[PDB]
Amino acid sequence: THEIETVERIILAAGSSAASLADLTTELGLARIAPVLIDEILFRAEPAPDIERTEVAVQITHRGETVDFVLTLQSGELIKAEQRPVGDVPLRIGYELTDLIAELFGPGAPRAVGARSTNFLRTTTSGSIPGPSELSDGFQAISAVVAGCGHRRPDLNLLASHYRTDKWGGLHWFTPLYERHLGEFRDRPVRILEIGVGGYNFDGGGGESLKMWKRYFHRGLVFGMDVFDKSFLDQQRLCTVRADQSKPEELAAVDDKYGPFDIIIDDGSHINGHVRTSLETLFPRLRSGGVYVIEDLWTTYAPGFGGQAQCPAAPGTTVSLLKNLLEGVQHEEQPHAGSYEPSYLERNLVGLHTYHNIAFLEKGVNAEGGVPAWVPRSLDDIL
Amino acid sequence: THEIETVERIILAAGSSAASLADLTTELGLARIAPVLIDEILFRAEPAPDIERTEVAVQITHRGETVDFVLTLQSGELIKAEQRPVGDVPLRIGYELTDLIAELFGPGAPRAVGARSTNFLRTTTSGSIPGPSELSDGFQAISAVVAGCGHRRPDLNLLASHYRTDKWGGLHWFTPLYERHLGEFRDRPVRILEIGVGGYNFDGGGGESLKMWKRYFHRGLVFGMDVFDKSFLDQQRLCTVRADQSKPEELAAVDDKYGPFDIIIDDGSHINGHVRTSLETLFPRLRSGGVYVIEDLWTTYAPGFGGQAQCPAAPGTTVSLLKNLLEGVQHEEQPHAGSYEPSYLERNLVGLHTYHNIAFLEKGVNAEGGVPAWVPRSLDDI
Amino acid sequence: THEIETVERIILAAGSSAASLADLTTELGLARIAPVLIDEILFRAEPAPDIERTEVAVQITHRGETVDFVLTLQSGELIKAEQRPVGDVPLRIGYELTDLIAELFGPGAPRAVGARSTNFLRTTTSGSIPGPSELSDGFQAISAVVAGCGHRRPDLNLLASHYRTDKWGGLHWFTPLYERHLGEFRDRPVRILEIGVGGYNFDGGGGESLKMWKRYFHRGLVFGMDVFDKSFLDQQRLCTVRADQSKPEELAAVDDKYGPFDIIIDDGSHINGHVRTSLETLFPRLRSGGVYVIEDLWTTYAPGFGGQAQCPAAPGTTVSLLKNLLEGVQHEEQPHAGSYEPSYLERNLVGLHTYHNIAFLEKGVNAEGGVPAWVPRSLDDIL
Amino acid sequence: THEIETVERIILAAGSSAASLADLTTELGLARIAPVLIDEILFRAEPAPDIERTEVAVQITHRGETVDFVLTLQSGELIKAEQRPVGDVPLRIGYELTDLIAELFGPGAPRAVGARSTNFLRTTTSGSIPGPSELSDGFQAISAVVAGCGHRRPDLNLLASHYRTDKWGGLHWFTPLYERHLGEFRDRPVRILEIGVGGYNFDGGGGESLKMWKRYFHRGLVFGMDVFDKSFLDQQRLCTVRADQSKPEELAAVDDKYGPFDIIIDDGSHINGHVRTSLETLFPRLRSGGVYVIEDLWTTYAPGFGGQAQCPAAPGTTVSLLKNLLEGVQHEEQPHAGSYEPSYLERNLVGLHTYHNIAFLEKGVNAEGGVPAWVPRSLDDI
Ligand SMILES: Nc1ncnc2c1ncn2[C@@H]1O[C@H](CSCC[C@H](N)C(=O)O)[C@@H](O)[C@H]1O
Ligand SMILES: Nc1ncnc2c1ncn2[C@@H]1O[C@H](CSCC[C@H](N)C(=O)O)[C@@H](O)[C@H]1O
Ligand SMILES: Nc1ncnc2c1ncn2[C@@H]1O[C@H](CSCC[C@H](N)C(=O)O)[C@@H](O)[C@H]1O
Ligand SMILES: Nc1ncnc2c1ncn2[C@@H]1O[C@H](CSCC[C@H](N)C(=O)O)[C@@H](O)[C@H]1O
Ligand SMILES: [Mg+2]
Ligand SMILES: [Mg+2]
């Protein structure tokens, strides 16, 4: 929890004042911040290009202190980093700590120039003209690390295919919809909760969507909730929590410890009652201006999921809930006793987006007022 | 019809090849195109700033030919243009015809530099530092005209307030939602249909929203359908049509004459049956990738509009329709005991956006396939 | 200085974590934050529409505390606000304090829905159908206040015409260039310095550009430096400083007290030596990744400005400086003794943008390395 | 020439009216257009994912006619397409011709939903939950093809690395600067000229940058000029031309045949005189609002490239030229003792962008007027 807190403080400083970032850099120090930034460069530079073992140095300096890391990249292998000297590495990237913190965790347009220093094959051990492979592999190696040092907008469809989540590809085509409804939050220091880590009780299974969310939300903290243990996936900005979406107390404990959440995604049991329980408990805890997403609406018709093989969808099914939420947004126009008090969902659901197998709920203040009484409601009133 | 066609050709060439624009400029000529561009400038420069009567010259040149216009701006007065010599007018703007066509009807980011020439008070009415009012009115006048010569993104909320449509302000707050769902089409040569011009049978009334759509869609042709005549609102890129949204034949005639439409907006009678008839007839005619919008969902509960004062909403009411459209998007996941072929709305509705008093329908191909049979449907399958 | 500090803390919290904003709201309290937000609504809602005197209520609530303000709008008059009851004002806007802080000072896309509550003529004292003026003036009045409650992107050309600065209109056409080079910083908590407040020694003169920068940078602190007093213009997010751009010590004192600056604009004396002194002293103090802007390059040829009526421009003139800066960006490719050490401007100028009467300097690390020795430099080397 | 013209007509119609697209689809027909679209899909879907041989079907329909293609993807292998029946292929993508034309060559935001149909493993090779590799390879294959069917914004840095051009990586870092200055033209039907195809006189060499420009400008026609033959690189939207940048007649011939150009990039000999000759001849031919780019400013100091090893840079060297262009932008503010008429570069250069080893020149109208005579020029004037 102190670890998540330290990464968060760096993320927030990246988007704050110069004085705030200076205070944090002075407080934590280069030795402590550097490894967090190298961890990000490794996660973002993946995957390594199809090249022979090639070393690339990253040097971070701050107020007279400098730390050097040598990253090793090779076709089909996890990129590795080591705090080591760089004098014999002809591929080098240099950064002021303030610049690298912004490059990785800063909001706003990626910088096109001036964020770093570069040394590319200024000396070659081969001879005078560097070998073809040496030159080719060099270009690819330094380019891969540079790509991992920044926050250039990624393509969520490509990320989904790379991390192997079923949010994109033949089973579902949700990623462009996520870009539409969540893209305005990409530069924001978000806390995202996804219910359903993936992999069920299979050992070593799941986390694909969580890694995608970590990559897309460069300033985000990703939380994954599952009834089964997923602690093996825990990493920088990615925390798994063991909890049951059927139990309101367990849901509230997740929010009490890791919330509040800007975005909540239901991709869990798909059991009709669990979807409803999760929305009733977490929608009031969701940040106002946030988005609640329900994936796999098809379970509405599957008895094995507490659904009913009937259309219109049976009450207590996800499609019936979505239809009621739709009418709820119009609560102020509905016939009601003056004493009527709107439900939480009626007052706090400002937008409903329904697509195939997915719904997006926008939380906000639904209180613009019903059509005034002085508006004609009949030709009788017109006349 | 030839007039609407000429403006359309200019708009389409503005986003085409150099050869296509060259061919159109050669065929129509400067004398014909320039008045279309001046009309746009007058429409987009409005309103005139709070200044005393001030003249600004606009000169358009093309392949050895040049035409001069002098615009007159004054507080509270309609901006006027006359084809006259620039002469002594000390506020001047010059353009190559190609640059002005792109500036007014071109897609893409507004140019920040190099699109025109300018002369500002090289000669004053004193012979030296101009009078305080001459300088202030001069800056305001030339700035107003230049603003009218481009396609810089407008604020739809401010346009709705300026043109006085109820789409924004206290009765409704729809304009930001329109920006969200129609913003991607602002650079497109769209044909927009709004059912409901406004003003009912009152003389000289309506057209506020149509003027807003003309200002927002700088490459768009705006069509307003109304059961009553609204020909007095007719102007460049803005055509009114007399037709009844309750009658499928009249809706089809509107589409056959002025379609197809990228965007259709129902802001008409608000009578439940008319909303259903308009959607059933025009949704199939809407361009795929287009957006159908229904305003005033409240009439769902008003008996005077064919509504029923009950909740859940009665069958045959707009909210009930929206709930059925929502379920139809999931048609591939629904149980179908025998041969089923999806309805048009099930197959062509890809997205439903429901807010307070407004719904946005995205038309497309809804055929990604239902969940495959090999997917577990129960722990017994597990 | 405690005032600037308090507005800054609110601005930074608007773009931080939920916990950070909660901590600040709890610390300062609604009573202290509310007036800062009302001050912004008045500055941004200006000008009032051409309407008869109309009242619009803004109500801000936070954790069981609520404060009500009544804004009065009238054709040709400064919008006024008073902490007052709202029961008899039929035009009302309601906000949670967290939502209003983000709406005014938050980074990111303006919210399209759910940020506030609205009451529009639910009761009219006139009768049942409100009068035409009453209805028309109402629409305009509430719309104007709503526009002042947010950060919807403004048009810098229109702002320049409204505030009456010569950056746009016949004398200059710089505002679209400012949008191009400074637009990526609009959502950033910037500190901007403009040298030249305007109005010279004329009493009550100047500040037009400063008000424009305050309006455009909704999260920004605007600083205006002038040899003459301009304290009468001082307001929320807008501080004037008496200092001389000819004196390096006075320039450094401005940066020591109000810096560091993300953006510095020279629109002052236009005296060739003052432009050079200002750039030599403040470019090293400018934030890396920031922009230095020099307006009115025409003084390069005006003897009355220490210029020379000659072309090519004489050494010590702004155009000559810009040409040397241009060559300086290529310092690594220039013939030099190996011992050569790049100047500050050579090492820290990554981009030079020259337009008519204006130049934009991008500060960053100019250290990608010169063309390697192993690159053929002659057909002799080729053969 | 007719082939380049047919692809150009398709691209222009993709951003035109419904009527214009309808007319082109009727005139050319599905049989003619579909192979152009399949060629784009193969170019944009590359590279194939690291999978075992997998087939993906693409079906395009138009007014009662439908054609089927089966694409084959395999690790390290060139993606192949064949016009064959979809048959049993379990990975399928369907498109209406109009939707596919817009998806590949349309301007504007990529569509997030409704642009196509899809079938994914409705039948597996086991009869039940597909084999682990069948499912993984299936997701990768269909995703790769769908990616190739659209105009989603690419990362120019990644494209430069994928196509292996030195515009990015250790020798140069220009691609983000290209995104800044050319990004606004990505949705435009551009004609781009790069002087310098690459590969010199080595057999089979060059074209890396030309392939990058084709991928980035999804509506663009790419032209590569080189003194040596590069016809082997010729492909859809990518034409090589043999011409000498030292010879004004050859540069004019390139423009007369394949112009006018929205963007011209000098990455050729790097010989100082050739850079000056190319700019003097082609800048007047460049579209106003267009961008002229000069790479490799370092040759300014290299005697083997006509440079002089001195600083300040010698007259007749590229850096000296850039310094003179910078001063020319201020031509209206310069003292002119007698009648002066500005040069072409003074009148048509509106912006100069100088970075390390690269310059971006914006062409436009540089005529805002010098400072008016009534402006004080001295405290004596004050
Ligand atoms: N009651 C419950 N509470 C929480 N998680 C549950 C649950 N029942 C099942 N789950 C988990 O929900 C997950 C659904 S699979 C999630 C896949 C992942 N989101 C991706 O897109 O890659 C499984 O891992 C399962 O263990
Ligand atoms: N059956 C029908 N067919 C078409 N238009 C109809 C109609 N019944 C009523 N209308 C028209 O629908 C309009 C509704 S008011 C439209 C307001 C306008 N869109 C604005 O925002 O400014 C009226 O002008 C009315 O005459
Ligand atoms: N040496 C100096 N140091 C600082 N400011 C100076 C100065 N000499 C003159 N100035 C101030 O520079 C200003 C130039 S006018 C600035 C106009 C303003 N930026 C706008 O665009 O609206 C004058 O107010 C003048 O008093
Ligand atoms: N006079 C001349 N006219 C045209 N091309 C020339 C030339 N002299 C040399 N060239 C060509 O200029 C090219 C320079 S290398 C181009 C690299 C390519 N743009 C890339 O980024 O991948 C060589 O292919 C060379 O043959
Ligand atoms: Mg799932
Ligand atoms: Mg309405």
Ligand SMILES: [Mg+2]
């Ligand atoms: Mg000035």
Ligand SMILES: [Mg+2]
């Ligand atoms: Mg090069």
